[PDB]
C-alpha cells in the first residue's frame, strides 16, 4: 500500500508488559551478571549505541569555547586571477579555433570546482560563525535596553529632585 | 435536464426543511412536543418524496456524464473539486453494513441453485399465507 | 543487510511528521483502539534528549508525537480537524521549536 505497515514489535507490548518491565529488567540484569530476541520484553530495553558510532541510511553514511587563513585568502585571489586569465584564453580559443574549445572548458570548471571545495571546507569553519553575528546583535540590543533604562530612571530622579527644590522654595 | 431540475428543486426544499428543523432545535429551550412531531413528519415524508422521485428518474441521472468547465480553474479550486467528486459512505455506515452481512449471514457473489434456492422458494409462501390470513381475519368482524 | 531496530524506529519517528500518514493511521479503528500503538508512542518519548535528538532529520515530528501524546487525553474525534489545525498552528509551533533549540 501507500503507507507501510506499522513495525511488528509495536503490537507485542501491552500495559501488562509495561508494568512488568521493571522486574523483567531486574531479572535480566541479574542474569547478565546483536542482542538475541529470546523474550517478547527485550525491545523495551534501550538499544545499545553501535561501537563504530555510524549510521547508514538511503546509501549515505553519518557519524568548545562557543558552547594560515592568509594562505587560503591569497590562494583564492590567485585562483580568481587564473580563472579570469583562463576565461580570456578560452574565449580566444572560441574566437580562433572553437572546434577544440571544450578541451579548456571543463578545465576552467575544475578551478571553479576547486574554489567550491575551498568554499565547502569553509562551512564548518561560516555556519558556527552565524552564532557570532547573533552574539553581537543581542548583546547590542540588551545594551541599548539597559542604557535607556538608566537614562529614563535618571531623568525621573532629576525631575523628582527639581520638584523637591521647587517645593522647598515655596516653603 | 428536466429530471435533474425537479431533483434540484425538491432537494433544495428538503435542505430548507432541514435548515428549519435545525434552527428550531438549536434553541436552548425545547418547544412543545406536538410542533416537533409535525416538523418530524413533514420533513420525513418529504424525504420519502425525495427517495421516490430519485427512483423515478434513474435513467436521466445515469445518462448524464460529469465534466468540469473549461472556464472553471482546477489549479485554485482543486480542493473544492475533490470535495464534490468523492462519494464514499461514512465508515460507521460501511462497518454497520459489514456487521449486518455478518449478523444475517447474507453474501451475494457465489449463490447457486442448491439449498438456499429451496429456502428462497419456502419463504414466498409464508408472506402470501399471512396476507390471506389477515384478510380473512379482517373480513371475519364487521368494521363498518 | 537487515537494518537494525534503530533505523526502523528513527524512520518511523521521522515519517510521523507527515500529516497524510497521521490521517491514514488514525483512519483505521484498530490502530487507535489497540493499546499497543499508544504504548509504543509513549515509549518513543525518550528521543527528545541528546544524543538521540542529534540523529533526527525533521524536528517537527518531535512536537507531533507530543501532540499525539495529548491525543490520548483529548479523546477518533478531532481527526477531521487535524490538517486544518496543523496548518493553522504551524507558525507558533515552529517558533516554540526554534526557541527550544536555536536559543
Amino acid at each position: 500500500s501507500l503507507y507501510p505497515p506499522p513495525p511488528p514489535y509495536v503490537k507485542f507490548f501491552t500495559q501488562s508488559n509495561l508494568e512488568k518491565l521493571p522486574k523483567y529488567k531486574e531479572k535480566k540484569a541479574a542474569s547478565a551478571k546483536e542482542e538475541e530476541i529470546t523474550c517478547a520484553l527485550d525491545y523495551l530495553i534501550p538499544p545499545p549505541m553501535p561501537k563504530n558510532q555510524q549510521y547508514r541510511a538511503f546509501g549515505s553514511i553519518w557519524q568548545e569555547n562557543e558552547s594560515n587563513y592568509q594562505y587560503k585568502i591569497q590562494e583564492l585571489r590567485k585562483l580568481l586571477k587564473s580563472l579570469l586569465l583562463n576565461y580570456l584564453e578560452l574565449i580566444g580559443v572560441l574566437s580562433i579555433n572553437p572546434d577544440m574549445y571544450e578541451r579548456k572548458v571543463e578545465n576552467i570548471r575544475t578551478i571553479l570546482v576547486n574554489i567550491h571545495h575551498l568554499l565547502n571546507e569553509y562551512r564548518p569553519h561560516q555556519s558556527r560563525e552565524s552564532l557570532i553575528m547573533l552574539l553581537e546583535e543581542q548583546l547590542e540590543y540588551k545594551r541599548g535596553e539597559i542604557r535607556e533604562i538608566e537614562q529614563v530612571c535618571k531623568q525621573v530622579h532629576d525631575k523628582l529632585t527639581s520638584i523637591q527644590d521647587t517645593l522647598r522654595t515655596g516653603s | 435536464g428536466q429530471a435533474l431540475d425537479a431533483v434540484r428543486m425538491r432537494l433544495a426544499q428538503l435542505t430548507h426543511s432541514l435548515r428549519r428543523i435545525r434552527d428550531e432545535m438549536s434553541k436552548a429551550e425545547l418547544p412543545q412536543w406536538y410542533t416537533l412531531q409535525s416538523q418530524l413528519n413533514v420533513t420525513l415524508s418529504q424525504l420519502v418524496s425525495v427517495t421516490s422521485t430519485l427512483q423515478h428518474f434513474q435513467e436521466t441521472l445515469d445518462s448524464t456524464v460529469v465534466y468540469p468547465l473549461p472556464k472553471f480553474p482546477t489549479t485554485s479550486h482543486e480542493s473544492l473539486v475533490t470535495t464534490l467528486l468523492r462519494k464514499k459512505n461514512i465508515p460507521e455506515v460501511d462497518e454497520w453494513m459489514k456487521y449486518v452481512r455478518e449478523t444475517s449471514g447474507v453474501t451475494t457473489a457465489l449463490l447457486k441453485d442448491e439449498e438456499i434456492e429451496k429456502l428462497l422458494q419456502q419463504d414466498r409462501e409464508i408472506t402470501n399465507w399471512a396476507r390471506t390470513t389477515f384478510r380473512n381475519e379482517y373480513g371475519k368482524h364487521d368494521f363498518k | 543487510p537487515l537494518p537494525t531496530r534503530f533505523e526502523v524506529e528513527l524512520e518511523f519517528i521521522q515519517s510521523l511528521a507527515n500529516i497524510q500518514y497521521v490521517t491514514y493511521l488514525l483512519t483505521q479503528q484498530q490502530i487507535w483502539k489497540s493499546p499497543n500503538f499508544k504504548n509504543y508512542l509513549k515509549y518513543l518519548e525518550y528521543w527528545c534528549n541528546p544524543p538521540y535528538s542529534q540523529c533526527i532529520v525533521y524536528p517537527n515530528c518531535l512536537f507531533i508525537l507530543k501532540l499525539l501524546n495529548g491525543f490520548m487525553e483529548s479523546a477518533l474525534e478531532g481527526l477531521d480537524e487535524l490538517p486544518k489545525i496543523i496548518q493553522l498552528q504551524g507558525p507558533q509551533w515552529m517558533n516554540e521549536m526554534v526557541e527550544r533549540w536555536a536559543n
Binding site: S1, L2 | H16 | -
Partner: peptide, 25 residues
C-alpha cells in the same frame, strides 16, 4: 419571488474517505 435562499452549509472540515492503495509500482 424566492422567500429565502439556503444558508451555505459547506463542510470543508470533512476529512473525506477516499481509499488510496495503488501507489506501489
Amino acid at each position: 419571488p424566492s422567500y429565502s435562499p439556503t444558508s451555505p452549509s459547506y463542510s470543508p472540515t470533512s476529512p473525506s474517505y477516499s481509499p488510496t492503495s495503488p501507489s506501489y509500482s
